[PDB]
Amino acid sequence: DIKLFGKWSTDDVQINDISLQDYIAVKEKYAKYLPHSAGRYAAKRFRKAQCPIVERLTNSMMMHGRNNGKKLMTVRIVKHAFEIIHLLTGENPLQVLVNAIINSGPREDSTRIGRAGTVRRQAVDVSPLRRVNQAIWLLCTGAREAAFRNIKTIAECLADELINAAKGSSNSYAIKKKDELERVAKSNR
Amino acid sequence: VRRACYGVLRFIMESGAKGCEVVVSGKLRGQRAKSMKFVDGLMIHSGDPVNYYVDTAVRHVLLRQGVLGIKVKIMLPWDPTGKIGPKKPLPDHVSIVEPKDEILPTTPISEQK
Amino acid sequence: RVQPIKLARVTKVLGRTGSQGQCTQVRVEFMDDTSRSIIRNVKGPVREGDVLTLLESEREARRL
Amino acid sequence: MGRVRTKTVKKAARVIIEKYYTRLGNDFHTNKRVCEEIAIIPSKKLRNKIAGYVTHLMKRIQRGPVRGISIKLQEEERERRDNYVPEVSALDQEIIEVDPDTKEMLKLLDFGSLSNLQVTQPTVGMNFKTPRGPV
RNA sequence: CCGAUAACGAACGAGACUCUGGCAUGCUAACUAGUUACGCGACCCCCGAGCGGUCGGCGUCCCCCAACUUCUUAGAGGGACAAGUGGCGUUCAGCCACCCGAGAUUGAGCAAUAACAGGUCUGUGAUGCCCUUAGAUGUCCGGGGCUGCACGCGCGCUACACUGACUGGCUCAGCGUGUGCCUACCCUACGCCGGCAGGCGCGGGUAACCCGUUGAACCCCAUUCGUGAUGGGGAUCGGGGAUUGCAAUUAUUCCCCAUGAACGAGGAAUUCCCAGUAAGUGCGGGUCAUAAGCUUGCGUUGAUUAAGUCCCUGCCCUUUGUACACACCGCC
Ligand SMILES: [Mg+2]
Ligand SMILES: [Mg+2]
Ligand SMILES: [Mg+2]
Numbered sequence A: 001d002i003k004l005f006g007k008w009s010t011d012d013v014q015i016n017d018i019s020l021q022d023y024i025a026v027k028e029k030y031a032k033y034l035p036h037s038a039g040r041y042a043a044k045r046f047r048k049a050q051c052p053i054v055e056r057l058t059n060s061m062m063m064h065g066r067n068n069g070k071k072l073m074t075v076r077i078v079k080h081a082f083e084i085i086h087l088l089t090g091e092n093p094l095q096v097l098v099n100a101i102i103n104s105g106p107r108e109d110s111t112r113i114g115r116a117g118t119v120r121r122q123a124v125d126v127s128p129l130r131r132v133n134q135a136i137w138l139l140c141t142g143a144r145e146a147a148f149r150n151i152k153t154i155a156e157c158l159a160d161e162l163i164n165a166a167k168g169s170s171n172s173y174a175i176k177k178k179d180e181l182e183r184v185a186k187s188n189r
Numbered sequence B: 001v002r003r004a005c006y007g008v009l010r011f012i013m014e015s016g017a018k019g020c021e022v023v024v025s026g027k028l029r030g031q032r033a034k035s036m037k038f039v040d041g042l043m044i045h046s047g048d049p050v051n052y053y054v055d056t057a058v059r060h061v062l063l064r065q066g067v068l069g070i071k072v073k074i075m076l077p078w079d080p081t082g083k084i085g086p087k088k089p090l091p092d093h094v095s096i097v098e099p100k101d102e103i104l105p106t107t108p109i110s111e112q113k
Numbered sequence C: 001r002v003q004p005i006k007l008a009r010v011t012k013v014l015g016r017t018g019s020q021g022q023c024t025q026v027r028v029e030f031m032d033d034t035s036r037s038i039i040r041n042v043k044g045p046v047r048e049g050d051v052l053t054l055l056e057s058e059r060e061a062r063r064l
Numbered sequence D: 001m002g003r004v005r006t007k008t009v010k011k012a013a014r015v016i017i018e019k020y021y022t023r024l025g026n027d028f029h030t031n032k033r034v035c036e037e038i039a040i041i042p043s044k045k046l047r048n049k050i051a052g053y054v055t056h057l058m059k060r061i062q063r064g065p066v067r068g069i070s071i072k073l074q075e076e077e078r079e080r081r082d083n084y085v086p087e088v089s090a091l092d093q094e095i096i097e098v099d100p101d102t103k104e105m106l107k108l109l110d111f112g113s114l115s116n117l118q119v120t121q122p123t124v125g126m127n128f129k130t131p132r133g134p135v
Numbered sequence E: 001c002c003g004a005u006a007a008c009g010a011a012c013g014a015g016a017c018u019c020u021g022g023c024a025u026g027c028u029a030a031c032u033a034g035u036u037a038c039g040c041g042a043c044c045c046c047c048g049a050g051c052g053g054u055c056g057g058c059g060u061c062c063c064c065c066a067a068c069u070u071c072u073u074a075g076a077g078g079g080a081c082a083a084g085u086g087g088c089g090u091u092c093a094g095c096c097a098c099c100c101g102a103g104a105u106u107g108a109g110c111a112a113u114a115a116c117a118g119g120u121c122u123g124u125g126a127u128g129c130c131c132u133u134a135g136a137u138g139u140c141c142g143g144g145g146c147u148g149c150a151c152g153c154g155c156g157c158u159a160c161a162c163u164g165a166c167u168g169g170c171u172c173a174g175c176g177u178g179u180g181c182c183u184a185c186c187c188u189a190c191g192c193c194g195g196c197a198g199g200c201g202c203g204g205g206u207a208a209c210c211c212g213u214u215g216a217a218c219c220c221c222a223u224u225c226g227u228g229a230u231g232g233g234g235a236u237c238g239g240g241g242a243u244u245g246c247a248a249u250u251a252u253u254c255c256c257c258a259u260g261a262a263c264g265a266g267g268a269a270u271u272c273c274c275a276g277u278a279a280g281u282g283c284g285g286g287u288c289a290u291a292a293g294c295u296u297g298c299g300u301u302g303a304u305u306a307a308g309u310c311c312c313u314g315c316c317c318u319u320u321g322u323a324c325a326c327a328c329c330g331c332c
Helices: A053-060 A071-089 A093-103 A130-148 A154-167 A173-187 B002-015 B049-053 D047-051 D054-061 D073-082 D100-106
Strands: A108-110 A123-126 B019-026 B036-041 B054-063 B066-075 C006-010 C015-017 C023-025 C041-043 C051-054
Touching (some): A108 A173
Antiparallel strands (some): C006 C051
């Protein structure tokens, strides 16, 4: 019905945990034909919670301070990486992306005001909006650092970290920081 | 200076105004110079109405000990509505006009004309 | 041995804490012992009435 | 939350409301217009905060009086009170419980006989005498 | 301000307003703005189509050979200013959410009582006192300097590259500016020569008529590069060509061909910011004979995060204390 980029039908993707069912933004109710709209989403809260997840990607990869208006860079790179993924695993790049999102979203952090042990004092759970926010940020920044001094363009970096996180491989920088945050929090329990 | 400014304040008030402000600056007798402000009545301070309700003037007085700074600020009562007092009264004056009795509690009454 | 990951609906929030807004009291329930709920501090937006993952139930309980 | 104010910025609406007691409501867009053009109030943002609970006042007056004070509240709401003057007497029963002390000092006004003045028995034992101590 | 209430009745700042931003196919009107329809002319497929479509080409105010203001403009208005609902609260003074709506907070101007030995006497023919006043601390002229460099600090700009550079092709803005009192000095189209810098004819414009439909940058799409301090970067450094200036050296500025240094994302610390926001990215004005890494504005692209707190810094009110009152950078 919506044929994302001429393909990748929305009514295929399955999200696992119902603490995220409503908080991933891939589904048909708001299935955009493309991740781009000046929709005043960040004006008030919780609209960006509904902002399509691919739109969040294209708006988050657009972050270095050198590139600051090149959203079209972002959509072209994400479309290329989506094509790359659908080539890599045959299944929906939307599906692999949501899998990486859930598998790289942390749950435990440390935050207090007292004398911090290693990061903070008290371990604390995270609500699944800062969780997915940090997850997509981590994916993006992994892609950026990976393509910084490599011949690989950001398209393939994003693709490979997306696969690595979705499967879970202890090699993508995203999950490699996720589990360290989780375990240092467990130490500061 | 006090007697003179009180006299001018008297005369301005009898001229009829919502208020006034006068400030005298400079060095009086003695070498330490400080101002001293005489006020009466109303004195709006902020927003557009000051541009066309209060008028101000600054004059420098060539005194043997130096110079005297004089500020005067009079406002014009609105009521003339175009005369020496300007029209468009201050917005906090939407005055409630008062009906008549408008009771008429009698029976339905017909008068033909 | 380790307590399983458990889900947690969030009811009315008591309010922020950490004297910076960094944490908030949430009153979660495990949708199975629905008559048992626990006070709990979380970070990030709460979206009153949403649901949250949880590893260890009996972690903390402090009243402001 | 965002539920912390100053009493002073709370001091916002009754500079207006009763002064123009004639044109309020229970309301969201048309006492809006009346509040646009009615004072010297130099800047833009705070129009909503003065005027939010404003029509909540005439909500109140449509269920109860309040300061205010709107000179229309009190005389109407007390004129309603003016009525309901009972036909029968609230005290006309012509028997009244009285204790022996009462009867006897009516005997020092020298009348305890020409009426009903029905006597109730005294407490006798008198479980009154408000308490004191432990044991 | 409710609410209390030895207070009552007022005044200033504060929250209206002014402009700006957000809408009206509602009003008035547009040959210095147009838009349509038409009639032309050129065009294309034409085998014919044909009301197929192209034109920022021409004309429809030299007086009908057509109308209209929608697009643009700017005035009048209106319009957005707690009307509806639910929920919270003594249900009291506002918010939360939702509906609808151009919009449920558009940013600025102003701004009280007082006060600061804050700065300015280099703004003035504003000025007191003092100083100088002919071998002038006046004034003008010539030259130099304000640019000077073992070092330390501030604001910035460019970069450290492949979300890139190079080359070529494509497609878009908005403020605002423009010919002279003195004062000479404007914005510039078009054409010709010169690779460029430029020059020479040739107009238009004192401006919604010309520059200008401001054919902006970023960005767009094809090429090359390949992770090399490399085609990144462009400091330093030679020679040549222009331009303004009476005068250009310590280089006014620009252009060409040359040279290719640090820089491989920076500590200790520290600044700004939350919606067209920060930032990328250009364009105007002032400065200006030549002058922008400055600044003021204008746009273009366009975010992440948060709707909390006193943790640091600091501020307002209330109680407390005190030996302080030049008021804790105090006192002792
Ligand atoms: Mg103001
Ligand atoms: Mg090179
Ligand atoms: Mg004390």
